[PDB]
Amino acid sequence: NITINTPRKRIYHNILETIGGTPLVELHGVTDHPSIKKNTKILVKLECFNPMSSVKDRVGFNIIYQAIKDGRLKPGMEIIEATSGNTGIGLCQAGAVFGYPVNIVMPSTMSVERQMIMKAFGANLVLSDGTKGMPGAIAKYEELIKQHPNKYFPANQFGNPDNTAAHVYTANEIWEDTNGEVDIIVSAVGTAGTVIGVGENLKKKKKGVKVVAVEPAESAVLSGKPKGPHGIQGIGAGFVTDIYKKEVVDEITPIKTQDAWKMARAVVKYDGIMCGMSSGAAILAGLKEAGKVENEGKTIVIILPDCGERYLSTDLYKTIEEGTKQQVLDSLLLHH
Amino acid sequence: NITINTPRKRIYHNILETIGGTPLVELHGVTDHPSIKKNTKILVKLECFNPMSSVKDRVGFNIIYQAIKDGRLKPGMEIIEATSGNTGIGLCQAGAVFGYPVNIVMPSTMSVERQMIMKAFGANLVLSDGTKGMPGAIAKYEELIKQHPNKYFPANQFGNPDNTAAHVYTANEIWEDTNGEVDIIVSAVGTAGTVIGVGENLKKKKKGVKVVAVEPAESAVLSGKPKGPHGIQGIGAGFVTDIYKKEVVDEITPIKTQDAWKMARAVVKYDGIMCGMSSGAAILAGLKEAGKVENEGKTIVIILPDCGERYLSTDLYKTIEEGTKQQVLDSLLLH
Ligand SMILES: *C(=O)c1c(COP(=O)(O)O)cnc(C)c1O
Numbered sequence: 313n314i315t316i317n318t319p320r321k322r323i324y325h326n327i328l329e330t331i332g333g334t335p336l337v338e339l340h341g342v343t344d345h346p347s348i349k350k351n352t353k354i355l356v357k358l359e360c361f362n363p364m365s366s367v368k369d370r371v372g373f374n375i376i377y378q379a380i381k382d383g384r385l386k387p388g389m390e391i392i393e394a395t396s397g398n399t400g401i402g403l404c405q406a407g408a409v410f411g412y413p414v415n416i417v418m419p420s421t422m423s424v425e426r427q428m429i430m431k432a433f434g435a436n437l438v439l440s441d442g443t444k445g446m447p448g449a450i451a452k453y454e455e456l457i458k459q460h461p462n463k464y465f466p467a468n469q470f471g472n473p474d475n476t477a478a479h480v481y482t483a484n485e486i487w488e489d490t491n492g493e494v495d496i497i498v499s500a501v502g503t504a505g506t507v508i509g510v511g512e513n514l515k516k517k518k519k520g521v522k523v524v525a526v527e528p529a530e531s532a533v534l535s536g537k538p539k540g541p542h543g544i545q546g547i548g549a550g551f552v553t554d555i556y557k558k559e560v561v562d563e564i565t566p567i568k569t570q571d572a573w574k575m576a577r578a579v580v581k582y583d584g585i586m587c588g589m590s591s592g593a594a595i596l597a598g599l600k601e602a603g604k605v606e607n608e609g610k611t612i613v614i615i616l617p618d619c620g621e622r623y624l625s626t627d628l629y630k631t632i633e634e635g636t637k638q639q640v641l642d643s644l645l646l647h648h
Numbered sequence: 649n650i651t652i653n654t655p656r657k658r659i660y661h662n663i664l665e666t667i668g669g670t671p672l673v674e675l676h677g678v679t680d681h682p683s684i685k686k687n688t689k690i691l692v693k694l695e696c697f698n699p700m701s702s703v704k705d706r707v708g709f710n711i712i713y714q715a716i717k718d719g720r721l722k723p724g725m726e727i728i729e730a731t732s733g734n735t736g737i738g739l740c741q742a743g744a745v746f747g748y749p750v751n752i753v754m755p756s757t758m759s760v761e762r763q764m765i766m767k768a769f770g771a772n773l774v775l776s777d778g779t780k781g782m783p784g785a786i787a788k789y790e791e792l793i794k795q796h797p798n799k800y801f802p803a804n805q806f807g808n809p810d811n812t813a814a815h816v817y818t819a820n821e822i823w824e825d826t827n828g829e830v831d832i833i834v835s836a837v838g839t840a841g842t843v844i845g846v847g848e849n850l851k852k853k854k855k856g857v858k859v860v861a862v863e864p865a866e867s868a869v870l871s872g873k874p875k876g877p878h879g880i881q882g883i884g885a886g887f888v889t890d891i892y893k894k895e896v897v898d899e900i901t902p903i904k905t906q907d908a909w910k911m912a913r914a915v916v917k918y919d920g921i922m923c924g925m926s927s928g929a930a931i932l933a934g935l936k937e938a939g940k941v942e943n944e945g946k947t948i949v950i951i952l953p954d955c956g957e958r959y960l961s962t963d964l965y966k967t968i969e970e971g972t973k974q975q976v977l978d979s980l981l982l983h
């Protein structure tokens with residue numbers, strides 16, 4: 313039989329109380345490959361189940377919550393961040409409920425759908441010149457911080473320890489859901505809050521947990537390669553972030569942009585999970601991990617940071633693989 | 649003292665096992681209005697928490713699951729439905745996991761984003777003549793069924809009792825989450841599976857539960873008025889569906905399209921919940937319900953069928969309200 317969800321047995325006081333507690337789900341369709349032994353377990357953690365459908369719900373919430381508790385954010389002050397992605401959404405959701413203005417700096421032509429989401433939450437969008445790109449946004453952000461040194465609270469997504477600290481919950485959920493069986497955690501790296509936060513908190517409970525960081529093959533800066541252009545949205549920031557701690561990470565797996573996209577298409581077609589681009593990268597790294605002989609029988613947990621619906625404006629679902637499942641998985645997983 | 653979500657303490661065997669069990673959340677921002685007594689409770693059920701983010705996850709799942717168990721859908725057969733919205737998504741998600749082909753008939757006039765999600769799930773899109781609109785989709789749909797009778801299982805979203813039956817779970821979740829305190833259930837009506845299924849199953853546990861159906865003021869056919877154009881996507885089918893049972897419904901509340909959109913904008917700004925268009929209609933009807941003097945102190949539960957992110961290509965978030973919360977709520981709630 314098939315048992316769907318049970319009642320949560322709770323009345324949440326506001327939308328922030330629904331953040332986290334996301335499902336951990338078995339992969340089956342894309343694990344059906346000779347390279348992966350049948351007793352190896354590959355589980356995906358679906359951060360799309362957050363109310364605004366990405367892992368950054370946790371990050372925006374905890375950055376703002378902790379700042380309020382610490383007195384670093386006080387009435388009269390406003391939040392600011394330079395972001396065109398999910399961090400802006402997570403900050404805008406938390407800011408709307410806590411009652412603080414949120415200023416988001418981004419180029420005028422960047423992620424117009426995310427602009428609309430953030431504006432709907434009441435954000436004040438600071439749109440730098442589209443012709444100037446993200447350097448124009450960074451320039452406008454720095455100018456604003458200098459013009460408002462006491463009024464603005466900077467989220468500092470790439471360095472804020474309250475980003476990393478949000479993942480005490482992520483890690484505990486993995487620990488509880490797997491009954492302590494988790495062996496490997498795979499996380500594609502943007503701010504590095506997830507890989508470091510989950511990795512540190514799992515390793516406190518179980519020292520032998522292997523931490524796998526994933527980055528674009530085209531911008532593999534954690535591997536010491538130069539920054540370069542890539543198309544795995546949400547990761548590959550092009551620099552080693554202040555949160556990143558190399559000693560927490562056991563392996564860096566680069567994933568090609570095109571393989572991340574192809575993996576994402578295969579996951580929705582063969583497992584029915586519509587995950588985002590970085591999720592495709594993470595899943596492919598995890599499936600390669602599941603093919604290594606020393607990993608037979610292990611429990612491999614893969615973070616899926618957001619949903620594919622956020623990428624319908626790209627060609628992620630316009631491109632079509634002509635081949636069968638086995639042709640697609642062979643093209644991705646065969647070492648030859 | 650904010651308590652965020654706790655672990656599910658479960659390993660789900662597949663994505664279908666994550667369907668349902670959606671959160672019930674207090675409204676506070678849009679309920680801060682003199683017309684609503686402070687002891688009345690207005691709760692929203694967030695069907696956007698389903699894996700493909702709408703109530704139709706439950707419907708597509710149960711229609712296919714029950715047909716497999718009953719042997720009405722047999723290996724070799726294929727699923728078919730005529731739909732451009734959430735019903736197709738829910739069917740495609742369940743079909744992909746159960747391993748059955750899913751055929752969605754719709755005009756080629758629909759935008760790629762609608763077809764994009766469904767084809768990502770491996771669905772076979774049978775695109776009818778773009779000029780002949782929705783009638784052409786039904787024509788092609790009836791021709792396929794008539795020419796291959798034993799091949800297709802029809803989902804029949806507007807008449808299928810396995811639609812309605814999915815909401816035994818929805819109702820039980822409301823019953824348990826409120827510990828039986830639910831007094832009024834508010835549901836905007838598309839297929840009517842939700843209002844009838846939740847209404848029937850709550851009334852079996854608590855006869856006094858009031859059932860409020862919501863429809864667009866511009867196409868208020870449940871009240872006997874003519875079909876007409878409206879913009880509350882997901883509801884206002886323009887006919888009285890086979891599932892609809894007038895005896896289950898205690899009140900029909902019409903909501904103007906523009907008021908539904910304005911309500912949806914207010915909910916995301918003041919409660920931080922980015923609900924869809926039909927959710928704006930349902931919440932506005934619920935807030936009016938919350939203003940009635942005989943409803944003081946009651947627990948009012950409102951179904952929110954999907955999220956606003958699914959409507960970024962529409963004009964939902966085009967208009968901006970310049971006024972304050974009180975100005976916006978006054979414009980929607982005062983007479
Ligand atoms: C982050 O916002 C994000 C990531 C990376 O997570 P970390 O910042 O490294 O914790 C990956 N993918 C998406 C879509 C994100 O939004």
Ligand SMILES: *C(=O)c1c(COP(=O)(O)O)cnc(C)c1O
Pocket residue numbers: 702703704733734735836837838839840841842843881882883924926927953954
């Ligand atoms: C249905 O798919 C739907 C409704 C109405 O639900 P019922 O079909 O009446 O149970 C309302 N809003 C949206 C977005 C829907 O998809």
